[PDB]
Amino acid sequence: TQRVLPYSNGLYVINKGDGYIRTNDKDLIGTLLIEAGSSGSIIQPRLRNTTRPLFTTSNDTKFSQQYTEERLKDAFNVQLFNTSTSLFKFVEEAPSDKNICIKAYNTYEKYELIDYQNGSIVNKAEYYLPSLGYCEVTNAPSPESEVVKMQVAEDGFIQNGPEEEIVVGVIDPSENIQEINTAISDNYTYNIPGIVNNNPFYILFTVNTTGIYKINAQNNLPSLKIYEAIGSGNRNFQSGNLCDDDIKAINYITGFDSPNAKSYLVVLLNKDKNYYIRVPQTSSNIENQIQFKREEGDLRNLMNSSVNIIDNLNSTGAHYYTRQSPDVHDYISYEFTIPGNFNNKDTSNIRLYTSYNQGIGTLFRVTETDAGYNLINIQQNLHLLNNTNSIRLLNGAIYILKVEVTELNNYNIRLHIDITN
Amino acid sequence: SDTIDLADGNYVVRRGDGWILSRQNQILGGSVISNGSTGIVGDLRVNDNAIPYYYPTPSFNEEYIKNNIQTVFTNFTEANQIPIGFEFSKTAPSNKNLYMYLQYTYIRYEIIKVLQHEIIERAVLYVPSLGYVKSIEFNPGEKINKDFYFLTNDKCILNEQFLYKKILE
Amino acid sequence: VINYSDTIDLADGNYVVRRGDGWILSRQNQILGGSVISNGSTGIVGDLRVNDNAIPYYYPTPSFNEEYIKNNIQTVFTNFTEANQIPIGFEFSKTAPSNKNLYMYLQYTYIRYEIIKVLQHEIIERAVLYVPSLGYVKSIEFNPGEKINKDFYFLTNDKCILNEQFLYKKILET
Amino acid sequence: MNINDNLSINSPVDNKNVVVVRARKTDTVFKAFKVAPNIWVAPERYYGESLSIDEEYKVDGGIYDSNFLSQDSEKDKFLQAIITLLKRINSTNAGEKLLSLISTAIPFPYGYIGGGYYAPNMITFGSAPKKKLNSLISSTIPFPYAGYRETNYLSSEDNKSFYASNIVIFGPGANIVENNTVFYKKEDAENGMGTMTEIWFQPFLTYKYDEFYIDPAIELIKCLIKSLYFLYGIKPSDDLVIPYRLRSELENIEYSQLNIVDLLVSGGIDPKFINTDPYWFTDNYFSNAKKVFEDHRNIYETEIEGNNAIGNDIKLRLKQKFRININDIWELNLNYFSKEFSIMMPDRFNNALKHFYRKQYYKIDYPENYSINGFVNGQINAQLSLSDRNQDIINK
Ligand SMILES: [Mg+2]
Ligand SMILES: [Mg+2]
Ligand SMILES: [Mg+2]
Ligand SMILES: [Mg+2]
Ligand SMILES: [Mg+2]
Ligand SMILES: [Mg+2]
Ligand SMILES: [Mg+2]
């Protein structure tokens, strides 16, 4: 009964809400007993700015306090950890009938730095940033009631604020970032430098023409991931040049983590925004190039998604392919070739389905026409989750299936090709 | 209190917030407002008024109490350097006089020694948390109850707590 | 899908522009902290700063450096460098309704100044400057476990909670 | 209190005990470690002096090495040696009192920006909504609450963080066998306000005088005592000097002289001829410094005391600072600590030793050659090795 997190491999900072206090009244500023008709004020006037942030970690040599603070600075651009000039005051007017207790607690905002890999958190740190207080009002306890003995609770935190989960990916500081200072023309070839010796790295670039781009590597290997710099281009700007705002907060768009998977990215890019492209660790000394090409034909129908190239579909029978599933309402595509020689009359019975995740699939066929590269929409609204319907497809033909994840039930998505005849 | 259901040893206990000391009620002063006015009496917990009051025992000296309490409960040495204000406001009715007096509230901590499930030793620390005021509308020459002014023994204006942790050797 | 168009109907040259008051920045919404009040209590948040100045956010260009930007903005507009020495303060008061919890959080507002280079009825270069003006709070009444709109907490791109302005003057070397 | 022990040259910068701060106003920056409240150690050479100087400007008997205290291993050895010496000083009641006095003798902070020590300006905050319109129902707070501008602080490299500091213990300057005590601001050092004090100390080298080695702890104590004149702003005029030794070696009549602070701090037999029960030597400095000390005490007693818009961290330290009298500082010297610690020291003309005999330097190692109990096997039978630098001594 574990909820699925569709995040890609990398480092994330999550704002997990406000109004966190410690157990056993560790953060109790104090209690006011306000008589009937009276008012009660509790002020933090910030006569001294000092605050006391809290920090726990699953590993102090990697997710240290300095490292966690820098990641917080990358995600939400926080810059005051130990100090704060922001005041907060609570006023409660007791009604004319009864008395009122008010309890004022110092609060914290719970940021969580996670290192998400293969659908499981491998490292995790909690930074509690000094917040602006919590006040609970209660009826005055009737004298004298009666006291119940209690053991102190375990060290922990209680949230009194609203539910909140704001996930922001951040740039890994151990991976070098290469910046393309001039804007991206409709066609470009980036030569991966020899300095980054097959280490995973980012390419920061802007685009000249708003539109859909196919981005890949040589032979579509390795797979690439693409992020958008959050809030980029709302500030200093020079025409045709990449005005970089030191924005390390990144929004995942699409891309596969498996470096052995053949894939190419079809993604819509804006000329006002800046984008990161992560290429993973290659286990070879292979010189590689990142090919950017503005798409004008029918491939515009594949945005935004990574298209997975299927090679071993060279026999009849059962095949299945497992890849990192996208989030809800996101896309993943598969380009595959039906086995057998193509003569436009030989056909085979194909069944497409998924095992756990529900999705809506659109099937395109690749044919060369007067225009050239051309996708023909041949199947719409195919519900892949344990789908029972099959279709006859031409042997030796290329097909592209675009799947939109409508229900997330597993970290991976398993698409099967069942070929009879 | 005697014979608790605890194993032998030493314990740190939090008794809750809202403790007012005996005979200390009106030592801070009072205000007399009248005829539709509003009186606001308050204080700022900083420095000398934030210094806690200790009451040790032969086994539990000042350092033992302070270190154990701060290890388990809120660290009051750091937190009392940051000023914290509080205030109370009351409005006098028309053609009448109202009196209001202020007294600090304290967090009451205890260091207790249990031997054969019976408390044989208790040391007490009062940490100045905040304040509490009491008001009454009075006529010229009217008698006032002795309970409003004076307090005989230390008491908690709220529900008392008992949060215990065994002190490890 | 949405485009920002950099052509402007101004002459060719360099221009200092005040874009107005009440600018909030991306991802910096809840970095100041928030207050949670409950059941008829009044929460008051604010910020008074004896501390002369809050840092201004520069975003300059090759043509317009910080010296250029600062000198021109202070020459035409508010002398912010020295005016930041004088104190400033504000407050916001909200009342939680009965048997309901309210959450409020504060963020700084800014004056957005721009240095634009206009060439053939189009801006070819723009430098930006945020000067801290005042604060702005956002609140919500919530229940335990209630899902909250993601836009209440997080802001993807810079915006102006007020009406944007364009108060320009053509920069002339004198 | 006790000196902080968990410090290493590689200890991470935490902005509490390990800081990286600017040197005065220059573009130079150094790493410092807080050992006691308002007491720091910077295990590097002193920034203010060039480590390579002219051959004409090298003093007689000095040793010059530009590459000393450059490695991090040397820095850690220096830091641990200073920590050991401070622990030894704090292990005795007299030395512990001296260290506590240094910790509490903060320089007098300047008043509010507009000028004055008396009171803040107050301000109003808060409101009750409403029938009533509770607009003036609110809280009142003193506006600055800290307006006193302290002069004893190290500024971080970004110039955004400030750390209180009374004493910083540096390494040697150009001359590595010359301990020294310098002031942050001369004006504040002489006007009774007081100023931060910096110390150049050499803990790795001593010299043998008449069958015993000089204890580095008492050399540090001399520097610490001299720092009291700067902390209390009672540094006399530079012209206040006393005759110390008639230069009978020269053909003509010539007197060597010494500053009154060096005489009153170094101790020995010499200062007894100047400090007499009936004073025979007087100057405007004594009365004037007593007057300015009384002035600052009055400033505290009348203004700073009755001002509850100050943290205790300033006014309580001022309270303990003015518990001492000026004559206490004047009467304080090295003989008292020589008796208290049972430490042997030169007694005759201890500031003119460079003339009477030729020092040879022995290397001190910690904790093998020197522990919290002083030298192992005492100052007489200590197994010390002649330093390799005895050949580098300038002979003028
Ligand atoms: Mg927890
Ligand atoms: Mg182009
Ligand atoms: Mg188009
Ligand atoms: Mg694989
Ligand atoms: Mg599998
Ligand atoms: Mg604490
Ligand atoms: Mg305006």
Swiss-Prot record, chain D:
The 133-Lys-|-Lys-134 bond is cleaved during long-term storage; the cleavage site is masked in the M-PTC complex. It comes from Clostridium botulinum. Residues 1-396 are annotated as: Light chain nLC. Assembles with botulinum neurotoxin type A (BoNT/A) and protects it against pH-mediated inactivation or protease activity at pH 2.6 (the pH of the animal gastrointestinal tract) but not at pH 6.0. Necessary for neurotoxicity. The lineage of its organism: Bacteria, Bacillati, Bacillota, Clostridia, Eubacteriales. The record marks 131-132 as: Cleaved during long-term storage, protected in M-PTC complex. Coiled coil: none annotated. This is Non-toxic nonhemagglutinin type A. Has 3 domains that are structurally very similar to those in BoNT/A; light chain (nLC, equivalent to the light chain, residues 1-408), N-heavy chain (nHN, residues 409-829) and C-heavy chain (nHC, residues 830-1193). Forms a highly interlocked heterodimer with botulinum neurotoxin type A at pH 6.0 but not at pH 7.5, called the minimally functional progenitor toxin complex (M-PTC) (BoNT/A, botA). Belongs to the botulism non-toxic nonhemagglutinin family.
